[PDB]
Amino acid sequence: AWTPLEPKLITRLADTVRTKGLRSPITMAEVEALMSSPLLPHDVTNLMRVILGPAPYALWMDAWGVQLQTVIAAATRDPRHPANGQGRGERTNLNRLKGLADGMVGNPQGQAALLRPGELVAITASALQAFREVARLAE
Amino acid sequence: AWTPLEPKLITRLADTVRTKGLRSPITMAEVEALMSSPLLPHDVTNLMRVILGPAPYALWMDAWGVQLQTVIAAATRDPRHPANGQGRGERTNLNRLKGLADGMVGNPQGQAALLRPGELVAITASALQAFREVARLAEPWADIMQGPSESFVDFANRLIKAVEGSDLPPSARAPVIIDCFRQKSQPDIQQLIRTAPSTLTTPGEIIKYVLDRQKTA
Amino acid sequence: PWADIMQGPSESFVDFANRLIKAVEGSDLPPSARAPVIIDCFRQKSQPDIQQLIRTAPSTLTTPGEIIKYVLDRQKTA
Amino acid sequence: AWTPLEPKLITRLADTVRTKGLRSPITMAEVEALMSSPLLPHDVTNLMRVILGPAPYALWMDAWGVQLQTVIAAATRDPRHPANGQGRGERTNLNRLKGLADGMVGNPQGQAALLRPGELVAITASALQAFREVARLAEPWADIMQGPSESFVDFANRLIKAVEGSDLPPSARAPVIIDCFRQKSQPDIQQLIRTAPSTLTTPGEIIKYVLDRQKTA
Amino acid sequence: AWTPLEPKLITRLADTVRTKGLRSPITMAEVEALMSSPLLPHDVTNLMRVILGPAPYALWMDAWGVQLQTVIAAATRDPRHPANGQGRGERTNLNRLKGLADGMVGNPQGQAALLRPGELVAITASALQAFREVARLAE
Amino acid sequence: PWADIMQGPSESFVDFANRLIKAVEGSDLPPSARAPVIIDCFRQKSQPDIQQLIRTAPSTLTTPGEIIKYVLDRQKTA
Amino acid sequence: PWADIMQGPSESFVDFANRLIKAVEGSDLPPSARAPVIIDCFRQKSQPDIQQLIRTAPSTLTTPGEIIKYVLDRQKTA
Amino acid sequence: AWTPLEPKLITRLADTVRTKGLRSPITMAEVEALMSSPLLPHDVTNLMRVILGPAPYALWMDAWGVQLQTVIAAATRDPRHPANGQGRGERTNLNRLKGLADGMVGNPQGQAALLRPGELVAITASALQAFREVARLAE
Amino acid sequence: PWADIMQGPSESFVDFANRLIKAVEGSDLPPSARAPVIIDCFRQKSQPDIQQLIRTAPSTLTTPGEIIKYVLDRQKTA
Amino acid sequence: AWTPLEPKLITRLADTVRTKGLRSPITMAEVEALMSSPLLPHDVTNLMRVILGPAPYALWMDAWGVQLQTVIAAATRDPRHPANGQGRGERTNLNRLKGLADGMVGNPQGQAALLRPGELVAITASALQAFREVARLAE
Secondary structure, three states, rough: OOOOOOOHHHHHHHHHHHHHHHOOOHHHHHHHHOOOOOOOOOHHHHHHHHHOOOOHHHHHHHHHHHHHHHHHHHOOOOOOOOOOOHHHHHHOOOOOOOOOOOOOOOHHHHHHHHHOOHHHHHHHHHHHHHHHHHHHOOO | OOOOOOOOHHHHEEEEEEEEOOOOOHHHHHHHHHHOOOOOHHHHHHHHHHHHOHHHHHHHHHHHHHHHHHHHHHHOOOOOOOOOOOHHOOOHHHHHHOOOOOOOOHHHHHHHOOOOOHHHHHHHHHHHHHHHHHHHOOHHHHHOOOOOOOOOHHHHHHHHHHHHHHOOOOOHHHHHHHHHHHHHHHHHHHHHHHHOOOOOHHHHHHHHHHHOOOOOO | OOOOOOOOOOOOHHHHHHHHHHHHOOOOOOHHHHHHHHHHHHHHHOOHHHHHHHHHHOOOOOOOOHHHHHHHOOOOOO | OOOOOOHHHHHHHHHHHHHHHOHHHHHHHHHHOOOOOOHHHHHHHHHHHHHHHHHHHHHHHHHHHHHHHHHHHHOOOOOOOOOOOOOOOHHHHHHHHOOOOOOOOOOHHHHHOOOOHHHHHHHHHHHHHHHHHHHHOOOHHHHHHOOOEEEEEEEHHHHHHHOOOOOOOOOHOOOOOOOOHOOOHHHHHHHHHOOOOOOOOOOOHHHHHHHHHOOOO | OOOOOHHHHHHHHHHHHHHOOOOOEEEEEEHHHHHOOOOOOOHHHHHHHHHHEEEEEEEHHHHHHHHHHHHHHHHOOOOOOOOOOOOHHHOOOOHHOOOOOOOOOOHHHHHHHEEEEEEHHHHHHHHHHHHHHHHHHHO | OHHHHOOOOOOOOOOOOOHHHHHHOOOOOOOOHHHHHHHHHHHHHHHHHHHHHHHHHOOOOOOOHHHHHHEEEEEEEE | OOHOOOOOOOOOOOOHHHHHHHHHHHHOHHHHHHHHHHHHHHHHOOOOHHHHHHHHHOOOOOOHHHHHHHHHHHHOOO | OOOOOOHHHHHHHHHHHHHOOOHHHHHHHHHHOOOOOOOHHHHHHHHHHOOOOOHHHHHHHHHHHHHHHHHHHHHHHOOOOOOOOOOOOOOHHHHHHOOOOOOOOHHHHHHHOOOOOOHHHHHHHHHHHHHHHHHHOOO | HHHHHHOOOOOOOHHHHHHHHHHHHOOOOHHHHHHHHHHHHHOOOOOHHHHHHHHOOHHHHHHHHHHHHHHHHHHOOO | OOOOOOOHHHHHHHHHHHOOOOOOOOOOOOHHHOOOOOOOHHHHHHHHHHHHHHHHHHHHHHHHHHHHHHHHHHOOOOOOOOOOOHHHHOOHHHHHHOOOOOOOOOOOOHHHOOHHHHHHHHHHHHHHHHHHHHHHHHH
């Protein structure tokens, strides 16, 4: 069952990003805090939509896609990925990682249903690395 | 058994709508948060009565009715609706969706008794879409120029905001943002983008390139 | 008093509608007389540009929400 | 048996390309006309050699090669191509498509002998798409404003021309044309479109409305 | 088999429209002449693209759509339309009239294959009436 | 004479390319020596703005058509 | 003469409709040609404000009485 | 047997409508007075032809038709209408209400013969409501 | 000291590269840390014209030799 | 048995490269002279380390690697390479060509022991072509 993040925490994090900036160690610590439980693509996408401005959000979408592509290359380079399965029918496509696959587009409940925990942690680590890249790039 | 939403959360959401507005992404996130569990028509109706002003509330009632009517048309177009049943005696009328049916008018307990979970989730999704419509309606990309003294990240923020918060289809935003970066964004950056040895096919890539090679001043 | 509410020369239409609906619903009228009064106050108040905008409505508007939506669509951006 | 195209038609088409240009709809119609029967690589190659200048001819050779390579990738992705056969011995190489294979180099008769009709139609469609690409490449919508003295039909013509002859997807032209009518088209017509009692959802409808209610002057 | 109209006739008609205008009786006679054989949607569309300017072409697309919609209303009002068939499986959709149906988009050969002669004559009459409307409207 | 062709200060690039390809193909060179000559004439003629535009090409351009496409994409609109 | 009847700049619409229907019914037209003529005279006479009011009718008006009712409903009170 | 209304009363009512207007309470009282006995469609039609101008008469014909249609909808919604009968052969069509049915067109005697008293009172009430609508609309 | 080496306003790029590679290889760094340091010093030193020239590299340069070749190709002849 | 090149010849060649440059025909002739006997990877590597500056040496390492990779592609394209053998156990890896294989790293004696004469001549020709490329590139 999907539970959304508190809008109070999200508002506090947005104001933190607004006053301290993207690169302060306190901001990265707060992001790591709100990045503790494995989030669904819907959660991370809406979180970055709210806390980041338009141009940093575009940059972050780009960087997140690139990092997820690196993850999928490593996944096709190793059939023992915690997102993959043993047979070929469990291979994870980027539509399933970005939340674009069938039964997931716009629906967080179905998303949480079909996604694997390894998928969730890989998406989360990818999003964190992308946030780091964009923060280092913006300023 | 029906449990009401906390008036503390409702007060915080009302003040959020009061300060940030109806269309801010933080406000939509908060509404999605308070729209997590399937609500009864009583809950959503009182919620919109409290958080919205009078005129937005009228607009929202209209939009909610229209969306529920579309849902009921799809329901009569498919007897396998999670709100419907298999026989004809379980067909769901708009009086049952809007909470106007018998045994439901003004009573949330009876409402929660007779309603289906599919009914609840359909009502909830309809109310969310209606809220989105009214928010887009209550409050121009092709008129945006980069000022002579404005930086490029501010111009990009303003342009992406106005393009994504507009009436364009989702599949037409990236090409429009790119072609607006190329034709707006005063001729120094125009020539900087024009003389790009690589082909830039994404707003993020254009922003990165321009931020790298921009004239520090 | 609802019958003394006018749309100011510089006031937007959503503020005027909010003020009018507030004063009409928080008054001594019966519940079944609020919508017609709100409509007829939209038509006679709401300075003559919006008056003519509502008058020349190819469709018949029979609800305050519909009038508000129509006016917000076709209003003079300024 | 191979029959050459008339040099009279080719001369008329060359003069059409010389006066009207590469991108005019009349020129594309004439090319479609002379592209009616499936042509051999020799025919299309000589045709483009005659009607196109040197630099457009180089560009067209490049684009034709790229499109033929896409065709051959689709062919190796499907053994049921009308150019392919069922066994592996009928697989079609780019030397056979470009006319470079054995028994074809410089000889149109042998070319017509060994080539398949599916091969011919694929080559022809590839050449047509390459011509379209080069024409779009050889010769900005967001910078178009209605001049203070310009009429509205001239502005609409110029805007629709620049929007349809651009890099936008086909499904994004109408919304862009509408939103450019609304934000360009100096504030008298802007207010005329804004105060439209009906909702205008098509460039033709907007043009009709504005032409009806325009300020005669 | 589809045969294109001569670009010489089309060039002469375009220059006629350029000098005499859209509403002259000689121009309407020339259009009736080039509207003699039943044309495929591709032919009429390209013809109007070439002979008409951009704004008259937009107006003509609008008017042609409206007239085709009236035709389809009359067709659903009478199952004996020369474009329709007897069973319900031959009912003609606007995607088939405007050339947007499956197997027709951009391909005139397939267009000529699947289209009916009644379909062709209805499309042609609709296009002629739309041209008349736009000519009466432009000047 | 192909080796005397320069891109004028006011001339566009497609006209210069047309003139150069015409003079090179209508000359006494062997057929297998026209493309390298056209490329090396694009690089050394074609006044220093386009010279630097071709020089700083992140990709390697090995055909006159590819050079023409690249230059037409990244040319200084003026 | 019916074909010379125009709605004056200051004349109301009911007076114009009365005058036009009078002149059309008291003329040499066949009985089956009066309604279409009255409609098409409402559309082309009846100065451009009412012309545009009739033009932008979301419904199709197919009778002089219906046109009169519509115009009387949505007319610019002045 | 049909008896016409006095032209003296009709002339006085016409002058009343001419001086006082359509909406004055005295005019509505006079109309109610001349609307006392159930009138045949011929009577009401000629009365409105005489007392009303051309444009109000067109409006009144429209409104009378609409009100009669509402009456016929209520009649098909209840087989116990004083205009209807018990069997289906007495169902009242709009041609019989507007006086357009067979044996009634232009003949008031035959009209009075075939019409029911319930038909007459329904026609009369419909005409009165239509007059009220048109009077409220004209000024 | 390698971290104090800047490309002078009038110095050529091959002299700067020679000096920098000399000072980096004749220093106390481990052998496996010289190439990344030389690259990142090419990118941050080497006055902003060459900095932007390296930044806008359509290809990814992952070796000091490749960076030197690219810069020597696309450098501003002066 | 490995015999080193004379440091006197190497010093003379280094001064030749210093005064005449990399591209002079006399310099290429001198390099061809000192490239007469098949050299071990150690010899050519130290020779280029001494005669070339730091940046030309980096360029030359790159070019030598690329040319050796082309050689190894031709070798896997033909099992009759004078560096290869008949069975698959004699296939020559780039670690054996660049002197990086086991028993060769830093030891010229072991290098000369395990290397083939075909290997030596291929390495030598590759190094000569790489020197030509770098000389054409440097000036």
